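Task: sequence design from structure.
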């Protein structure tokens, strides 16, 4: 069901949360080789999550589930914000700009923390 596919996508999301927090520790500790690998892993988790979210939205649309479509449109818009911040963080790491990497890291945390009540609303809506 779309609801079980949402639980799967949510789990991939939570894996990224786990990897992100680990990477943050590695950044603070100055273990740049670890950070590089965690950024690669996160890129792959965000790309997967983004694809699953699109399949859930398309399915809600085909099902005529107007409320779920509304919430998923809002949630996926916010996802793209996160993706843009992530991609800026990755570029800051490439460029050796630790000040920007810090800034983007904190912003990505607040953007994700903000979009949690909505994530929980979508679970119930599908």
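Answer:
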């Amino acid at each position: 069901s779309v609801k079980s596919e949402y639980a799967e996508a949510a789990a991939v999301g939570q894996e990224a949360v786990a990897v992100f927090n680990t990477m943050k520790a590695a950044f603070q500790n100055g273990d740049k080789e670890a950070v590089a690998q965690y950024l690669a892993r996160l890129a792959s988790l965000y790309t997967r999550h983004e694809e699953l979210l699109n399949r859930i939205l398309e399915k809600a649309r085909r099902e005529g589930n107007k409320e779920a479509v509304t919430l998923m449109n809002e949630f996926t818009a916010t996802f793209q914000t996160g993706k843009s911040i992530f991609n800026a963080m990755v570029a800051a790491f490439k460029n050796g700009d630790d000040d920007s990497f810090e800034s983007y890291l904190q912003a990505l945390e607040k953007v994700t923390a903000k979009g949690e009540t909505l994530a929980d609303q979508i679970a119930k809506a599908l």
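The chain has five helices and no strands.
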